[PDB]
């Protein structure tokens, strides 16, 4: 009776407040929770649709590394679930040609990410590798090659995932039913704002705030925080509406009675920036304290990184096994001639 949950990320570095907020938290609900059983991939092979340069892969291999020390620092158990690198689960190379085969491109080509990449491709003279077209195609094969029920999502990927979901109507459809037709949980609206109140906090814009970022480090970041450009001088009124100083208050600063008195001695002008900065850092570094703690029991005896990722590919290879040999039942290209020649 338990229902399979799969989501996961491109390996692309170390995680910040960002990723807390907006995924791993409800990640971390999702894997306490006794109803469901947690796939979480490190997609490797997702990271060549846009870096394909020698000097880029070579460094998936410290990505990999930096996403599973961050991971089990915030609580992700690889026992109870199954974290698994993406390339070494033989059957999603044949999973993925046969979605291929049955997704029509005019179907990918108007979900928003892959209209939006084709429109700046063609702008800069450029093309989209078929690969990169195949984004969703090979993100369905994650998806329904360990038949997952639920799949946790960000905004930019829930088209993603509708494509999956035709997916697998079209293969069970043709071939008999295999597949769950798999339920997006989706995410909040609003992801962090970053420091320089530019945009989301992201790793290429730099204006993060990381998991594995020291006191002084946080410090810093949150002293040259953007907070509210009108508020010229420290007696002038200042506004706490969109001020990511009270943004990030509201979600780290766990005393909330000081919270409100901060937002309205700020409103009145009668409190300097730097006593409400100070208390921002002081209250995000109690909140990361425990997970450096972890990290750096992690980094100083990696083979628990190593024995995660084993036990959860192990895991994931298992299910794909199963998963293709049902395929193969109900697909049955050349059903007779691969079972001669095995
Ligand atoms: N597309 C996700 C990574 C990913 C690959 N396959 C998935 C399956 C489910 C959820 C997420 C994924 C990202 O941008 O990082
Ligand atoms: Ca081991």
Redesign the pocket.
């Given at each position: 009776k338990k229902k399979r949950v799969?989501?996961?990320?491109?390996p692309t570095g170390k995680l910040h407040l960002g990723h807390w907020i907006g995924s791993i938290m409800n990640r971390l609900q999702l894997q306490n929770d006794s109803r469901y059983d947690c796939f979480f991939?490190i997609?490797d092979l997702?990271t060549l649709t846009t870096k394909t340069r020698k000097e880029e892969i070579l460094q998936i291999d410290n990505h990999i590394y930096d996403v599973l020390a961050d991971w089990l620092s915030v609580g992700i158990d690889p026992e109870k679930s199954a974290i698994y690198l993406?390339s070494a689960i033989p059957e999603i190379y044949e999973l993925n040609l046969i979605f291929s085969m049955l997704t029509p491109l005019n179907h990918i080509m108007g979900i928003p990410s892959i209209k939006e990449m084709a429109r700046n491709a063609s702008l800069n003279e450029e093309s989209l590798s078929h690969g990169l077209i195949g984004?969703p195609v090979?993100?369905s094969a994650?998806?329904l090659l360990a038949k997952a029920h639920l799949?946790?999502?960000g905004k930019d990927?829930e088209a993603?995932?509708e494509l999956t979901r035709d997916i697998a109507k079209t293969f069970n459809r043709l071939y008999g039913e295999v597949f769950p037709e798999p339920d997006i949980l989706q995410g909040e609206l609003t992801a962090l704002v970053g420091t320089n109140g530019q945009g989301k906090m992201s790793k290429s814009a730099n204006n993060a705030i990381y998991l594995s970022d020291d006191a002084k480090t946080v410090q810093e970041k949150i002293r040259k925080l953007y907070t509210d450009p009108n508020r010229i001088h420290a007696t002038t009124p200042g506004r706490v509406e969109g001020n990511p100083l009270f943004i990030y208050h509201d979600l780290f600063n766990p005393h909330k009675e000081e919270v409100e008195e901060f937002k309205t001695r700020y409103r009145q002008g009668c409190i300097r920036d730097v006593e409400v900065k100070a208390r921002l850092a002081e209250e995000i570094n109690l909140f990361l304290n425990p997970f450096r703690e972890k990290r750096s029991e992690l980094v100083a005896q990696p083979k628990f990184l190593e024995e995660a990722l084993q036990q959860g590919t192990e895991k994931m290879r298992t299910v794909a096994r199963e998963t293709m040999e049902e395929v193969h039942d109900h697909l049955g290209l050349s059903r007779k001639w691969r079972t001669i020649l095995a």
């Open positions: 799969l989501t996961g990320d491109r991939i997609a997702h993406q984004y090979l993100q994650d998806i799949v946790p999502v990927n993603h995932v």
